[PDB]
């Protein structure tokens, strides 16, 4: 009906739908406003933890993690000792984007594997 009168009033490839005696836009995901002219800020809810950075993207957000963190919300501290890296029964200590091996006496090296 009314969508027929002119060039698509809905920005960003939105979908015009006639309503009685006027009209409305069905916007593609990530866009808002009556004529879809506004880029929705998906980072408003502050989903990103541990000093991560939230990138507002089109229809979705992305969290860029500080080094050593992972997961959708950067809510997971990566376990650098999961693979059991330390040799000669050294003690792995999980740190921030790091792992420290504490050697028993007489052993040295990063993985505590020496004379």
């Amino acid at each position: 009906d009314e969508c027929a009168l002119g060039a698509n009033p809905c920005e960003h490839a939105g979908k015009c739908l006639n309503t009685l005696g006027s009209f409305e836009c069905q916007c593609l995901q990530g866009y808002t406003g009556p004529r879809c002219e506004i880029d929705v800020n998906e980072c408003i809810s502050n989903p990103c933890q541990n000093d991560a950075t939230c990138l507002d993207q089109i229809g979705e957000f992305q969290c860029i993690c500080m080094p050593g963190y992972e997961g959708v919300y950067c809510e997971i501290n990566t376990d650098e000792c999961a693979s059991s890296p330390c040799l000669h029964n050294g003690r792995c200590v999980d740190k921030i984007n790091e792992f420290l091996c504490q050697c028993p006496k007489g052993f040295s090296g990063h993985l505590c594997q020496s004379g």
């Binding site: 060039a7 960003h12 002219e37 950075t53 507002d56 860029i64 080094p67």
Partner: protein
């Protein structure tokens, strides 16, 4: 992309034509640049160019002034997949290539000359922020900014305005992205005609500017006379 990071290279000095490894460029340092843009990080640099990267052809040999080329372009353009965070990290590398200047980045013999690393806050705007980096071997002079793409507006480039002169609107675009109504129109999208002066607010109306039409039961030029 709704916004663009623009970087203008202005001057580079390498008077003794040396490489990072201490060897002299032979015969001269045929210099091209590599740009790595990413999110702000204070810790020692980790990982890829998250905001994008670009390389230039060779712009000069040893010391040279770099001039703009609207259409080897300068300023360089990095179009962004996201709303501008407000902070950033920028890494600029100066390189020497012994090969031909077409995509020097793909050439096998390349050697680094020097590089700089900056980080900070930047607001979207047309003003160029200017910087210099001096060291004993080389000097780099440049400036940068973040501006909206065509038809994007606002402090975060999140508002789109495209001018119309048809049934849905009659407007131009203001700097903030709000429509600026052509004469005789009103409303947010400038789709409301301004009826003839004194046309009765309740009893009269217009579909065209400077007109007065009467609703049922009314008459006169201003539609204010009952029956």
């Amino acid at each position: 992309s709704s916004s663009i990071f623009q970087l203008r290279l202005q001057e580079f000095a390498n008077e003794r034509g040396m490489l990072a490894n201490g060897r002299p460029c032979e015969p001269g340092c045929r210099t091209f640049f590599r740009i790595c843009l990413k999110h702000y990080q204070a810790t020692f640099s980790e990982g890829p160019c998250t905001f994008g990267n670009v390389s230039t052809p060779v712009l000069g040999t040893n010391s040279f002034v770099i001039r703009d080329k609207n259409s080897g372009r300068n300023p360089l353009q990095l179009p962004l997949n996201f709303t501008w965070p407000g902070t950033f990290s920028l890494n600029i590398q100066a390189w020497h290539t012994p090969g031909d200047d077409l995509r020097p980045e793909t050439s096998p013999g390349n050697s680094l000359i020097s590089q700089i690393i900056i980080q900070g806050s930047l607001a979207v705007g047309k003003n160029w922020k200017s910087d210099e980096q001096n060291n004993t071997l080389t000097r780099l002079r440049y400036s940068y900014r973040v501006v909206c793409s065509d038809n994007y507006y606002g402090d975060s480039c999140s508002r789109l305005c495209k001018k119309r002169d048809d049934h849905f609107g009659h407007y131009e675009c203001q700097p903030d992205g709000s429509p600026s109504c052509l004469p005789g129109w009103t409303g947010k999208y400038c789709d409301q005609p301004i009826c003839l002066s004194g046309c009765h607010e309740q009893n009269g109306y217009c579909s065209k500017p400077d007109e007065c039409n009467c609703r049922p039961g009314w008459q006169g030029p201003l539609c204010n006379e009952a029956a």
